[PDB]
């Protein structure tokens, strides 16, 4: 209840996920009802790279930006997940911002924080966030956490493994 | 670093202050003191505050900040871009949510740890010392006087 990763998971929920998820299904449903290659899935897919290697802003060639999810100010992007050149799925995808902070804390002396500490805190953040989202009222059936560690790796396949299984 | 406060201080810098401060002086110069004044109430009571702090205009990632006129005796004594440190709202919410297991004593201790951690980060950050001032305080009071004590001394 006092760790670095506990503070970050509660902040990401309090200051962002609790304010965006109550209206996320309505925005996806509106875009699906109004427009149409494939229906956009009803959940927010949050990428959780355990190595905390999050691009500055956001990101594989098989993950093509399709459009922005409009409001009923949050810019949420819809991506087309490709396989063999053709679209295999489509969803609102984004990186878990607090993993950038865990990476920065490991790079700056002022924090200390080793590479082993960062990897342990990243899994702890993922666990704490999972536990928050399981019991949170504003996050019932519209959020899926995608945690993974790169060792042949495809980010599009990791998201497709979760989209097909739902 | 070690605790909840350290993660919040580094997040506040990484995800917001490092992206907004490089261009803050240019926005103020285009449009008021040249620094961002961040209110840090140690009780984490972040609402909005005082009749002597009147909203003047908006300063035309980081998306817009408010300029306020600090009054004293009915007349304007200063003007600056002022805002609350959002992570203190999170410390307050963590104390109000059971699944966080964070007491009122924990919240006050983490609030001070956050102020000191963010002051150290900002002293050595290339995002610059000249564009940001932290205003930490605990109510036993005028919020306009606390800001004026820092504006006049700079
Ligand atoms: C605080 C929650 N948190 N704790 C940890 C740890 C990580 C996060 C996090 O990822 N937060 C987050 N992510 C976002 C993503 C989006 C999007 N476009 O998808 C929008 C958002 O909200 C506009 C997002 N937030 C909210 C805060 C960031 N914005 C900000 O500081 O804005 C300055 C500002 C100041 C005055 C006026 C207007 C803006």
Numbering used by the authors:
A (entry chain A): 152 to 187, 191 to 213, 216 to 228, 239 to 317, 322 to 336
B (entry chain B): 152 to 182, 194 to 210, 215 to 226, 238 to 317, 323 to 336
Provide text from the study.
In this work, we use an orthosteric STING activator and inhibitor from the same chemical series to discover that STING M271 is a critical residue for molecular activation. The M271CH3 NMR chemical shifts reveal a unique molecular signature for pharmacological or genetically driven activation and inhibition that is not able to be resolved by other biophysical methods. We show hydrophobic interaction in this region plays an important role in regulating STING activity.
THIQi (inhibitor) and ABZI (agonist)-bound STING155-341 led to the highest quality spectra and therefore were used for 1H-15N HSQC and 1H-13C HSQC resonance assignments (see “Methods” section for detailed description of backbone and sidechain assignments). Approximately 88% of the backbone amides and 85% of the methyls were assigned for THIQi-bound STING155-341, while 84% of the backbone amides and 60% of the methyls were assigned for ABZI-bound STING155-341. Since M271CH3 and A277CH3 are >10 Å from the binding pocket, it is likely that the large chemical shift movements are caused by agonist binding-induced allosteric conformational changes rather than direct interaction. By mapping the chemical shift differences between STING-bound ABZI and THIQi onto crystal structures, we found that the hydrophobic region harboring V155, M271 and A277 beneath the CDN binding site is significantly perturbed, indicative of distinct conformations between agonist and antagonist-bound STING155-341. Chemical shift differences are mapped onto (c) STING155-341-THIQi and (d) STING155-341-ABZI structures.
